[PDB]
Amino acid sequence: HMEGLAGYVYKAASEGKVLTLAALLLNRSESDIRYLLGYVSQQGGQRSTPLIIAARNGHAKVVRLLLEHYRVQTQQTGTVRFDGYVIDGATALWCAAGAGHFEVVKLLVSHGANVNHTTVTNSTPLRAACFDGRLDIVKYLVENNANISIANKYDNTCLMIAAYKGHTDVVRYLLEQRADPNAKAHCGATALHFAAEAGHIDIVKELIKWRAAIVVNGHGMTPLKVAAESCKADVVELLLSHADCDRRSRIEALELLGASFANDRENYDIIKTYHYLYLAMLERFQDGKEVLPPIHAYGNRTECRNPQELESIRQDRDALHMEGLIVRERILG
């Protein structure tokens, strides 16, 4: 078939048997060698070349040989599985970046690989490194002119995904490299929203430390409101020690957060419900409009209005729960 030996070459590459590879290649014509190494191979659904799976599997030895003696294109693209998913438009450098194989990444950059290559999703190898969180690669990739500002097909910046996958030190890095903190995603989010919802205290600090705009996302939710709906009390108290938000905004977050302690399934604390809801009851000579009891839901109940109204519920494990659901419906729908 001739293409059957192509599979043997792909095998040794994927398996890192650089011995097996070398002995397969030598004594063949350039016509032959360009083919064998150019063969796109669909092991299952994943279409890739010998160079790629080696970088995808961190096999430096075979990668070095392929890049030098046989002189293979670094721009070869394919479609590689990562945690079940098939990503498309990926080069060997995109694979080694996400796969955490530094030595291969260096090699691949050393032999003239596009550090700014975009996948079909428009994911730079720097993004893959940011998703994975291997700071050495990010450092190296950036120090070799990987553009930090190119983003996802949905404008998900390298900074966001790292703020999402809690890569605190990678985040501080991108920030030191003056990554734009107030870049906004399609859904309207900033890296603050991502970090707040994910409860990454350290990252929220660095984000605010770099003059993070408190922007409103596509849902119309500040990172404060998001972090309270995701029931991330720690974050919510941090952000609230930076005025910026009104008195209305400060209360809504408190109530929301308190509500999210009774609606949340994982974290659930009716004591922490009667705390953020009692705090919310603000006074002076001015106050703050409830809704009708639902056709049957929520036990046909009305939210508390007086601070005295609320106090009487400190001890009703049940009614407090119901109160939280009512509060959520008000500030959500």
Ligand SMILES: O=C1C[C@H](c2ccccc2)SC(=O)N1
């Ligand atoms: O959702 C994602 C994550 C992708 C990814 C997938 C596997 C390993 C590294 C990175 S890279 C991207 O931009 N989009």
